[model samples]
Target chain A: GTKQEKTALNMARWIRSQTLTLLEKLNELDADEQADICESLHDHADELYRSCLARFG
Target chain B: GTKQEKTALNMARWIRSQTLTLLEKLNELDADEQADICESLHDHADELYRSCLARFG
Candidate 1:
């Protein structure tokens, strides 16, 4: 089961780490790519939250 | 070009996802593992930020 990753707090911490990595990637992108990614990412926010809920709840 | 990455925003999203995954792993770890990972992660924070800056700037 891959150990079913635990705890809301821990999940939140992980989220923070992932966010940092994403920011780093974003920095490396060109302006158009940045715009596209921003749009995709904004859409992803809710999906990510839902995924978190599914995993944590 | 295999799709250029995005900007701070998209990168942030990815970072959040990775962070969440890390937290999930942390929760699954034994006490010692958890402690060690936490220590490693804390240390990684500065490195993460610097990397972000290097990419962004």
Candidate 2:
């Protein structure tokens, strides 16, 4: 893999962890609140998803 | 919010997108190959997750 590929892998790793962490934290709230936050938050996640594909795939 | 928190959110968003992108690409491979990669790739992802929690959560 090229330098870019390595960087993308590292970057992806970083994002996955963050998302999981956020989800765990979000779970402490009421179910409805957590659901709402997730819905709103998905946009950011989606953008990051596209970004990974654009950079690596 | 503090500058640090804002930065963390941005960073998390970035990471989240990247992971999703990588996952989609990984799907194109053979199931076994994909699973193996995922298992290997997960360590990096785990580190990233901890890093995110440490930085933001």
Candidate 3:
């Protein structure tokens, strides 16, 4: 049996976990207000991913 | 004062400490490469602060 070291996948998972934690904190607003913030964060996530790739790759 | 009322100040200090810790970890690259990362992170700091304010407010 071979154990694979998925470093990039682990890194991505950690990043996504952090992102979700931030989103959960942001979601402490009223539903409508939270929706607006969530939308902004969704856009921010794409940019963050691209930035991460640029830095790591 | 027994313990004192410095919740907000303490929170800000903790946040700044965490930010610096993250910066230090990110600075592990070569000096020239680290400069680029630092520049990107400087901008990320502004975004993070605004996001925190918006969520906390």
Candidate 4:
């Protein structure tokens, strides 16, 4: 197997896990409250981009 | 409804579509192949995050 492709599996696991947890948090929230959180963390997505660039890109 | 949250519902709609597309693409891919795609477009996640920042943050 191509090493890079194999690495992708590991990355996907972590990515899915992280994303799932995010969804879980949103699921716990009511819509208006969730809206507030969304606005609060709007810039926070940059956090993931910065992470992806650092780790993979 | 508060204007900000009503806006968030609209934002969530777009975000769901974007993420659903991603999940659709990912569903067809094999584990290894999916891994490759994730890495290939790893930066793609930044797109949503960027959008969130732009529209709301």
Candidate 5:
């Protein structure tokens, strides 16, 4: 694969790994704290441009 | 910001930009095609760890 593809794959892998770790950590938290963290995550996901359009379209 | 913070921020910015570009391209597609693209975007976003937890929790 080209360097560009490798870089993109690396980024994708990192995001997946980080998300897994984050979920593991969240599993140890209290319900309220977990809810807060979950809300923050949803906010970021909602901020995705495609999401906004998909939702509004 | 710390190096780690900078790196994470860069990733976030890049994801946001890519999402924007993707939406722009989708906007150029027909209504049905746009819906399909939007659905794929949502699938990726849903695959996020926090989102999965938030949704099923």
Candidate 6:
């Protein structure tokens, strides 16, 4: 359990960074482009929850 | 090609929402607590890229 939590913690931290990095530039894109980026990230984020739960939960 | 682009756009959007929601309160947490949350999200996010590519790349 402890080990799982550690993995989870590590994974989450990395996700946050990748997200923030993209977010910084996301605003530079126009509305349509921005929307496209958001949608992609959203799907991945949702799946991440599932993956993490299965692997580390 | 189009289908894959659509998938990416959709996922990106969702990720943005979830991350933004969590980020709203992230500032409330102390450094240590925030770090913990970030770590977990990070690991999951990394896997997300992997999953995305494998499934929809």
lDDT of 2 by residue, A1-57 (tens): 556455555654555456655555444433344334444444444454454455456
- Model 2 chain A scores worst on lDDT over the 10 consecutive residues at A26-35
> Candidate 2 residues B5-56, lDDT tens each?
5454455455445554656555543333433444444444444444545545
Off by over 4 Å in 4: A2-4, A31-57, B1-36, B39-44, B54-56
iRMSD for every model: 8.6, 10.2, 7.2, 9.9, 8.7, 10.3
The lDDT values for all models are 0.45, 0.48, 0.41, 0.43, 0.42, 0.46
> In candidate 1, what are the lDDT values of residues B1-57, reduced to their tens digit?
233422453444345445445545545544334435444443444344344444554
The candidate maximizing lDDT is 2
Over the stretch A1-57, how does candidate 4's per-residue lDDT look in tens digits? Answer: 345433433444445444444444444445334434444333333443343344444
Model 3, range A1-57, lDDT digits (tens) per residue? 011112332333344345444455444433334435444544544454444456554
Model 5, B1-57: lDDT tens digits are 444433333433444345444444445443344435444544444444333344333
- Native-to-model Cα distance after best TM-score fit, residue A40 in candidate 4, in Å: 22
TM-score of each: 0.33, 0.34, 0.39, 0.34, 0.34, 0.33
Regarding TM-score, does 2 or 6 come out ahead? Answer: 2
lDDT of 4 at A7: 45
DockQ score for candidate 3:
0.13
Question: Which docking category, incorrect, acceptable, medium or high, applies to candidate 5?
Answer: incorrect
- Give the DockQ of candidate 1: 0.18
Window of ten residues with lowest summed lDDT in model 1 chain B: B1-10
Local error of candidate 1 at A30, Å? 7.1
Q: What's the candidate order when arranged by decreasing lDDT?
A: 2, 6, 1, 4, 5, 3
Name the best candidate (by DockQ). Answer: 1
Off by over 4 Å in 3: A1-16, A31-57, B1-19, B31-35, B54-57
- Cα lDDT tens digits, model 1, A25-57, are 554554344434434443343344445445445
